Amino acid sequence: NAMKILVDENMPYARELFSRLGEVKAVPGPVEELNHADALMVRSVTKVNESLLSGTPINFVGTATAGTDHVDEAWLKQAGIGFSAAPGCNAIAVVEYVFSALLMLAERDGFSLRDRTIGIVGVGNVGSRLQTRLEALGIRTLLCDPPRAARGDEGDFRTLDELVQEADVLTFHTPLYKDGPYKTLHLADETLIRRLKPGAILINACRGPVVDNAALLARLNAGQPLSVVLDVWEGEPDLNVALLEAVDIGTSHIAGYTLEGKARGTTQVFEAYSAFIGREQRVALETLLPAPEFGRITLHGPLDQPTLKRLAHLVYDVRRDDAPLRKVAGIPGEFDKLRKNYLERREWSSLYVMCDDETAAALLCKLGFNAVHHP
Amino acid sequence: NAMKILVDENMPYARELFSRLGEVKAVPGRPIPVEELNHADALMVRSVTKVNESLLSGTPINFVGTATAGTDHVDEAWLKQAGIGFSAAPGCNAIAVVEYVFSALLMLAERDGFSLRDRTIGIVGVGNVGSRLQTRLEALGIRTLLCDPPRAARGDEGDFRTLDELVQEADVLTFHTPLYKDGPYKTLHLADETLIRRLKPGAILINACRGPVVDNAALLARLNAGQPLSVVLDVWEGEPDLNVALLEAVDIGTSHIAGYTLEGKARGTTQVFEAYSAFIGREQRVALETLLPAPEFGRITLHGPLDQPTLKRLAHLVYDVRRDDAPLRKVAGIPGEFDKLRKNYLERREWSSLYVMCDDETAAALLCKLGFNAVHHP
Ligand SMILES: NC(=O)c1ccc[n+]([C@@H]2O[C@H](COP(=O)([O-])OP(=O)(O)OC[C@H]3O[C@@H](n4cnc5c(N)ncnc54)[C@H](O)[C@@H]3O)[C@@H](O)[C@H]2O)c1
Ligand SMILES: NC(=O)c1ccc[n+]([C@@H]2O[C@H](COP(=O)([O-])OP(=O)(O)OC[C@H]3O[C@@H](n4cnc5c(N)ncnc54)[C@H](O)[C@@H]3O)[C@@H](O)[C@H]2O)c1
């Protein structure tokens, strides 16, 4: 008469949390416990399907990821088995990766970020959060999301062609669709890339094939005035290395990797499961996380661009992941080795900022720092 | 019957500081009206004023101050002969330069994925800057070799090695000598063609002293030949007309700004204020914090022990040398922009302006030794 919850043994905080609801056995991502369990919380490694579950009493499957590729959500729901992913769990990580790249390019190239026009392609978990933060800085942002538009969501949704005409930063946050009216495979092909404004910045931290890597390379090689930030590559793990040499920032598909991010995976699945069994519970994310290296800092004066750059980069400077990828890119095994070995990264909210300036604190909070004003 | 003190009208904090000791009149440094020198008790100058018998003869001036690290514009011997007090500001800008060097090295260590404590640092010239660099590398347990024959010939105590020995055993080589055109200590092109070529594979070469200490032509020649070398340059042969292709090739190139911190610049006036206070029987020490505006980031907490990445984050919160390398690459071949970058140089602070509270006592001890204002808060 209590629930037996199997959790993956390398899933952070899983034992801590799930015991608020039942007995936890930690399985490596083993038959005997499956047939005598009521719930299963997994990571990407475990294919979840009829094969593995049919016949068991398992009544709920949580996956601690934004992704769901490795699960057949369909069969479970067909079967009456509750399911939950952790959508958006890594979203803030990507937004701060994007901000980290932009603030570096803004200093390196002597331009003013508040002056840019930013087109967001895909306004979902990642793009909507990016929109919120760009707006708080008063940066004009153009939104492109034909599905949301078609479905009747509110907002000023423009066409991709419109974004290409008006933006000088273009960032992609769509899924990978290979056909249909919303096809995103090679959404950024030679024709689109070629129309990009002089000095435009192209950012792809979503899925590799959304950008045609060979065409992008060719335009860069012909001298198109264009800056590029890539976190995802066609052909991963065997990226186009020549392309890496021509981009301003390339990293090994680590944009989503923060500590807070891994912990939200476990956290959301906990909350869904707690709701599933009539015991809705929430969890302080700060109760779980170890203190970061730099926890508190004072700020004197207004927030300006260089001040914001020093703040974000104190937490995460994208160049620390760019440099090691350049050192090993054409060596088989190494791309994947940099993901497995990924070093601890925190989010801006882990940093407590004490501002004597009221406006700097208001702005920092809207950017996602834990900022306060000191009268 | 108050002291009359003449101050170069462009020296920072001059009136604020000296009007504590006497009447203070601001004067241009070139030329100084003679009526003024004739009624003055003390003169505080910058490098534009040649101080010698022609300037001071027959005047009542009993002390000369120069808010300046160097003493080329001053006839010190003559001042001794005449009984006139003198003070420069030796080392006023040394910490600026050292924190600049650390900024560059911490950037390269991350970029290239090496640990600092696996590098051997040869310091050439071990005076005000060289010996501060030493202290700090040694506090980090980084192996350093010292080269400074003028100190060895004086019989100074230390492990003084020859230049050539540094070239065999060091993979970081950094120059802090003045420029001597000849004599036994000639530093002109001290790092020439032959010397550069012998630098260990993966070597890092830094020059933040005087442009012509390193043969820029030879260096470019080696780089073009494909020698695995890293180069950090803040000073250049033929400034402001630097070798542009040598710029495109170095890892970091900045526009002779290594010494430019608010602290460096205010310390010229400070050390001279201090020396003069003592000279007239009013020994007075003055703390920079009460003169300089408060810094943007004045306090931060550090949880746990220091490691290299943590130290890089701290040094670069304060000063990331890349912020000076980037503007120079944008405008290097445009005649006049180099001087314009120095003229409008934006505020830079020293590590001592960051107050660091560490829950690890050994992190505190170390950061303190490194020049942060670090304190253990259990
Ligand atoms: N780089 C990383 O480490 C990492 C981390 C997190 C997410 N991602 C990827 O980034 C992408 C965005 O993630 P998310 O969490 O926001 O997912 P999401 O499902 O919340 O949002 C995707 C949005 O794109 C929109 N979209 C679909 N087709 C489009 C089209 N053709 N043109 C414009 N918009 C379109 C959808 O309507 C949806 O609003 C996904 O591909 C995700 O897998 C990568
Ligand atoms: N880049 C900048 O913005 C900047 C700022 C400050 C100082 N500097 C320069 O850096 C140099 C160091 O300044 P400092 O305050 O340490 O001066 P310093 O006089 O205290 O140091 C010079 C040291 O070098 C030694 N030396 C002389 N000739 C040598 C040689 N042949 N080989 C090895 N050592 C030799 C001397 O014995 C002395 O110890 C100065 O020349 C100064 O002009 C540059």
CATH assignment at residue B287: 3.40.50.720
How many beta carbons lie within 10 A of that of residue A14, not counting itself? 24
Q: Which of B176, B222, B256, B349 is catalytic?
A: B256
**Å from A182 to nearest chain B CA?**
40
Indicate if A317 and A352 belong to the same structural domain: yes
Residues in a beta bridge with A144: A121
Indicate if B227 and B163 belong to the same structural domain: yes
Q: B372: phi > 0 → left, psi -120 to 50 → alpha, else beta; which?
A: beta
Indicate if B50 and B105 belong to the same structural domain: no
Chain B partners within 8 Å of A306 (Cβ): 323
Please state whether the peptide bond connecting residue A237 to the residue before it is cis, i.e. omega within 30 degrees of 0.
yes
- Rounded CA separation A360/A43 (Å): 39
Residue B334 carries which side chain, given as an amino acid letter? I
Residues in a beta bridge with B26: B7
Indicate if A218 and A307 belong to the same structural domain: no
Alpha-carbon Rg for chain A in angstroms: 22
Indicate if B232 and B98 belong to the same structural domain: yes
Distance A164 CA to ligand 1 centre (A): 18
Instruction: List all residues 6 or more positions away from B211 whose beta carbon is below 8 Å from its beta carbon.
Output: B179, B235, B236, B237, B238, B239
Question: How close are the terminal C-alpha atoms of chain B, in Å?
Answer: 53
Where does a domain end: A265, A291, A317?
A291
Chain A partners within 8 Å of B110 (Cβ): 319-320, 323
Binding residues of A for NAD(+): 145, 174, 231, 256
- Rounded CA separation A85/A48 (Å): 12
How many beta carbons lie within 10 A of that of residue B207, not counting itself? 26
Smallest CA separation from ligand 1 atom 37, residue: A147
Q: Residue B173: which of B197, B149, B148, B144 has the closest Cα?
A: B144
Q: What is the DSSP string of B206-252?
A: EE-S-GGGB-HHHHHHHHHTT--EEEEES--TTTTS--HHHHHHSSE
Q: Which contacts of A42-48 are long-range, i.e. CB under 8 A and separated by 24 or more positions? A: A42/A8, A42/A11, A42/A70, A42/A71, A43/A8, A43/A10, A43/A11, A43/A265, A44/A69, A44/A70, A45/A8, A45/A70, A46/A8, A46/A70, A47/A71, A48/A72, A48/A76
Q: What angle do CA A66, A72, A73 make, to 5 degrees?
A: 65
Q: What is the DSSP string of A208-239?
A: GGGB-HHHHHHHHHTT--EEEEES--TTTTS-
Indicate if A348 and A232 belong to the same structural domain: no
The HSE-up count of residue B228 (CA atoms within 13 Å, CB side) is 6
Q: Residue B103: which of B334, B363, B346, B317 has the closest Cα?
A: B317
- Rounded CA separation B111/A190 (Å): 32
Distance B138 CA to ligand 2 centre (A): 20
- Rounded CA separation B89/B17 (Å): 15
Helix and strand numbers (H, E) in chain A are 17, 14
Q: 């660099």: which residue's tokens?
A: B133
**Å from A15 to nearest chain B CA?**
26
Q: Is the dihedral of CA A251, A253, A256, A260 positive or negative?
A: negative
Please state whether the peptide bond connecting residue A290 to the residue before it is cis, i.e. omega within 30 degrees of 0.
no
| Residue A298 near residue B297, CB atoms below 8 Å | yes
Q: Which contacts of B184-189 are long-range, i.e. CB under 8 A and separated by 24 or more positions? A: B184/B149, B185/B149, B185/B150, B187/B125, B187/B213, B188/B212, B188/B213, B189/B213, B189/B214, B189/B215, B189/B218
Give the CA distances from residue A335 to residues A212, A248, B152, B239, in Å, rounded to whole numbers and listed in that order.
20, 18, 51, 43
What dihedral do alpha carbons A198, A199, A204, A209 form, nearest 10°?
30
- Rounded CA separation B270/B284 (Å): 10
Indicate if A60 and A6 belong to the same structural domain: yes
| Residue A310 near residue A107, CB atoms below 8 Å | no
Residues in a beta bridge with A63: A42
- Rounded CA separation A259/B228 (Å): 37
Q: Residue B208: which of B164, B155, B172, B158 has the closest Cα?
A: B172
Give the CA distances from residue B112 to residues A318, A342, B169, in Å, rounded to whole numbers and listed in that order.
15, 17, 20
- Rounded CA separation A267/A84 (Å): 11
Q: Which ligand is nearest to the CA of B260?
A: 2
Where does a domain end: A232, A256, A280?
A256
Instruction: List all residues 6 or more positions away from A340 whose beta carbon is below 8 Å from its beta carbon.
Output: none
Q: Residue A94: which of A317, A263, A257 has the closest Cα?
A: A257
Indicate if A326 and A314 belong to the same structural domain: yes
Distance B161 CA to ligand 1 centre (A): 61
Q: Which contacts of A29-32 are long-range, i.e. CB under 8 A and separated by 24 or more positions? A: none
- Rounded CA separation A233/A208 (Å): 4
Where does a domain end: B240, B259, B278?
B259
Q: Is the CB of A106 under 6 A from ligand 1?
A: no
- Rounded CA separation A157/A134 (Å): 16
Distance of CA A49 to the CA centre of its chain: 26
φ, ψ of residue A349 to 5 degrees: the values are -75, -10
Q: How many CB pairs below 8 A link A and B?
A: 63
Give the CA distances from residue A343 to residues A340, B110, B378, in Å, rounded to whole numbers and listed in that order.
9, 13, 27
Report the SS3 class of residue B301. strand
| Residue B372 near residue B319, CB atoms below 8 Å | no
Indicate if A150 and A194 belong to the same structural domain: yes
Pairing of strands A117-121, A169-172: parallel
Indicate if A214 and A311 belong to the same structural domain: no
Alpha-carbon Rg for chain B in angstroms: 22
Number of domains observed in the structure of chain A: 3
Question: Reading across the β-sheet that carries B3-8, which strands appear in turn?
Answer: B22-27, B3-8, B42-45, B63-66, B85-87
How many beta carbons lie within 10 A of that of residue A125, not counting itself? 18
Chain B partners within 8 Å of A345 (Cβ): none
How was this structure determined? It was done by X-ray
What dihedral do alpha carbons A121, A124, A128, A130 form, nearest 10°?
-60
| Residue A103 near residue A312, CB atoms below 8 Å | yes
- Rounded CA separation B22/B41 (Å): 9
- Rounded CA separation B66/B83 (Å): 17
- Rounded CA separation B304/A205 (Å): 33
Question: Which stretch of DSSP H or E encloses residue A299?
Answer: strand A296-299
Q: Domain of B282?
A: 1-93+260-294
Q: 């997994």: which residue's tokens?
A: A42
Indicate if B140 and B48 belong to the same structural domain: no
| Residue B46 near residue B29, CB atoms below 8 Å | yes
How many beta carbons lie within 10 A of that of residue A32, not counting itself? 8
Q: Which two tokens stand for residue B209?
A: 């002293």
Q: What is the resolution of this structure in A?
A: 2.4
- Rounded CA separation A331/B234 (Å): 35
Question: Reading across the β-sheet that carries A200-204, which strands appear in turn?
Answer: A140-144, A117-121, A169-172, A200-204, A226-230, A249-250
Q: Quickly list H helices, chain B.
A: 14-18, 34-37, 53-56, 76-82, 94-112, 128-139, 149-154, 163-169, 193-197, 216-224, 244-249, 262-279, 308-318, 322-331, 337-343, 361-370
Q: What is the DSSP string of B173-215?
A: EEE------SSTT--TTSB-HHHHHTSPTTEEEEE-S-GGGB-
How many beta carbons lie within 10 A of that of residue A141, not counting itself? 23
- Rounded CA separation B355/B287 (Å): 15
- Rounded CA separation A282/B179 (Å): 68
A107·B326 Cβ contact <8 A:
yes
Indicate if A129 and A40 belong to the same structural domain: no
